[PDB]
Symmetry: C3
Subunit: 148 residues, 3 copies
């Protein structure tokens, strides 16, 4: 198998795929909140589900969208950075720690966001998860630059 290309790769692929699934869960939650609160973005959706007055914004829907957007602002870069980083021959335990901190940080972020936990709990989880991303980015920069 080509997953054995690098010692850190399986750990990366596990954490990244779990986080993609976690984003899919947010998407599903968003849809279920739209239906339960009857708050649709489109008139065609609203007319199917009770009438044109249900084409409206809702605070819980907007919150779900913000969590999903923040995921796109953070998890997508990790998908790129963590993949490249996996092939730079990092220490397996150190790599594991990078991936685990991001995984735990991001899962905690979604729980804090959707669960409406007091500030700055969500903010701290964002910063915590950004740390391994910043670390990997710098390491990729050094490897790329030295190979020019």
């Amino acid at each position: 198998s080509l997953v054995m290309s690098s010692p850190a790769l399986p750990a990366f692929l596990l954490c990244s795929t779990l986080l993609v699934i976690k984003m899919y869960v947010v998407a599903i939650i968003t849809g279920q909140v739209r239906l339960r609160k009857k708050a649709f973005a489109n008139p065609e959706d609203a007319l199917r589900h009770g009438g044109p007055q249900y084409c409206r914004s809702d605070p819980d829907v907007e919150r779900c969208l913000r969590a999903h957007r923040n995921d796109m602002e953070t998890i997508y870069p990790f998908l790129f950075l963590g993949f490249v980083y996996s092939f730079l021959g990092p220490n397996p335990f150190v790599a594991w720690m990078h991936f685990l901190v991001f995984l735990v940080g991001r899962v905690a972020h979604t729980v804090a966001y959707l669960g409406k936990l007091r500030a700055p709990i969500r903010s701290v989880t964002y910063t915590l998860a950004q740390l391994p991303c910043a670390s990997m980015a710098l390491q990729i920069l050094w490897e790329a630059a030295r190979h020019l």
Copy 2:
């Protein structure tokens, strides 16, 4: 060529690249709608194109933005999942079917969204396209876990 690294890779690269181009088309459509409806997000844009009153929201512009955002919520994960999945030695025909269902589902989604087709046509196309993504995610999880 390194496209011959795996039998499923060319099919993946064709479908993914077509979908990226499809996202670029949505971006172009969005810009053209902004100009035609004179609905700009920025005062500097508005002042160039008729005056400050044209810094305003528009339902068709917002619809275009929603289609583009939904693309980012779905196609970007596919770019990651489908790439990794291509290297897991899946059955070539089965892999083809995963990529084709996503491609057809997503193109149909954009047509349904921008064309304002009746509910739940758009919703169904989203769910249909998510199926192969869910499938690939699970398969990656198993391969990653078994290599830890």
Copy 3:
């Protein structure tokens, strides 16, 4: 090192990683503007930082969000396209030029957007940066199709 897999790869990894860091800078700027202008998206954030009246929109915050979103609409596709393109054996100088035009175009885009430069400066930087992306997409299409 696996960065020596293709002659164009180090150039790609340098430009892409710089652009991811550039997106992180936009995220940080956004947060700092929220705090300085006291414009928070969440009631829990607002109550921590002065009261419920500070859960409000702000034009500068919205501008930052638009720049970040446009980055997601353009840089993320480049991360995929440029990576694949790096392995298609392109002319090293030609590949360099693709990556440099995108890097300069996108950095200029963020400066033009956040700096509120007159139209159509921002619009032109977007189009300029899309050119190498369009080029790479077509090249990937040809390579993928010919390997089917």
